[PDB]
């Protein structure tokens, strides 16, 4: 059996766990970290936010099984048990549980987050990233965490509150048929806050229908893009690129790099009788495969883009293992 071409049995419901595991399994820097045993020296056994390493260890054993080449499929049962103890969208919980089980910080310091105070974006963003790293420093931060900018303007006191905040994936609103760029553009478009989600202005201590505008500051080696289809489901066809997604026009950081991305995995959802599956590119032969619980089959790029596409995993070209741009 070819390593990585390994299915996952359906324990029973479990939402898109298998689909998510297949996307994470075919995230090369993450799988390489576990197969090379780099996680043992970084297991955090005394983290009040973690599982005493049990999520990272069960995930590591699962990954090792899937890339041993001994199995056509395996059961992710132990890993599911640990994830369910961590958390009574699943992807945020998976990345958070791995992160805290591997957090290189032993005791998180309390950090006061200053408002921009009219300082330049670069200063404020580097401060925010340094503070983040003072509390969160792991392989998960290294692969998946980026930084975005939030600008809130008070309709009452005109206070301009600017913050930079970490993300481990981007939830995109959906603009019939649309392109991915249109969804990102809409994600960065200034909206007014509704009465269903006001903002607490700290200057007059009232909740406000503030304007909110998001901007992208820095992008991770692996950019995970969640298309917001739930909250019934929007079946919009979102056209996205397989290769050469250029994010540079959306970044406001002038010191970001080339930021070109190639698709590596897609979580699909059908008929929400809802069911999730995955397309993923195998790191050893570079071909595309379709993962449906225990079933693995060959796929071609021309079926990847569909109304079913739900979560997209992109890897930045300059971070590719073994090739230098
Ligand atoms: Zn105010």
Author numbering: 255 to 342, 354 to 440, 755 to 810, 817 to 857, 860 to 912
The authors write:
Ubiquitin-specific proteases (USPs)5 are key players in the regulation of important cellular signaling pathways through catalyzing the deconjugation reaction of ubiquitin from substrate proteins. The multifunctional protease USP15 regulates several important pathways in health and disease, including TGF-β, IGF-I, innate immune signaling, mRNA processing, and mitophagy. USP15, USP4, and USP11 share the same overall domain structure, including an N-terminal domain present in USPs (DUSP) and ubiquitin-like (UBL) domain followed by a protease domain that harbors a ∼300-amino acid insertion predicted to contain a second UBL domain.
A C-terminal tail structure unique to USP15 is rich in aromatic residues and folds back onto the catalytic core in the structure and is located on the opposite face to the distal ubiquitin S1 binding pocket. The active-site loop regions between helices α5 and α6, also referred to as the switching loop (SL; including residues Pro342–Gln353; PQFSGYQQQDCQ), and residues between β12 and β13, referred to as blocking loop 1 (BL1; residues Ser810–Arg816; SYSRYMR) that engage in USP distal ubiquitin binding are partially flexible (unrestricted by crystal contacts and not visible in the electron density; indicated as dotted lines in Fig. 1C). Equally, residues in the blocking loop 2 between β15 and β16 (BL2; Gly856–Gly860; residues GGMGG) are partially flexible and associated with higher B-factors, suggestive of higher mobility. As a result, the ubiquitin C-terminal GG tail–binding channel is mostly open in USP15, whereas it is closed in the USP4 structure.
